[PDB]
Design a protein around this ligand. Sequence first.
Ligand SMILES: O=C1CCCN1c1cccc(NS(=O)(=O)c2ccc(F)c(Cl)c2)c1
Length: 127
Amino acid sequence: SMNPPPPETSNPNKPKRQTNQLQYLLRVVLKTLWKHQFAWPFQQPVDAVKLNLPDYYKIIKTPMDMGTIKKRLENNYYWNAQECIQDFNTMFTNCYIYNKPGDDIVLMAEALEKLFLQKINELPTEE
Ligand SMILES: O=C1CCCN1c1cccc(NS(=O)(=O)c2ccc(F)c(Cl)c2)c1
């Protein structure tokens, strides 16, 4: 089971902009999760080949990871905060869909998601 192309991080005809909320998503939210002890499984797309997960991309049809999110934020790929928040939620949800309750990877996602929720709670008002 081969890996798919990763999610796009560049698309010239996609409308995009910088907002103060998107800056916060990079400087606070992504930075916080990225430095966490449990970040590493989430720092790049799932390599189904090297991880011996041949069913991964038969089950997970909307893959997402923080490597992709990081690049999207660095490239100002998003139009608004909700697009980026949705990417984080997709990443967490994928983990819970694919894996079993109590698996190490799920505990790791749960810890990252708690921090995500704490930071998004203080998302600044736009502009
Ligand atoms: O579901 C996801 C999203 C991100 C990676 N991932 C996933 C699911 C199932 C196995 C693996 N393989 S692994 O990277 O070597 C691994 C990583 C952390 C762990 F705690 C354990 Cl027990 C194994 C990865």
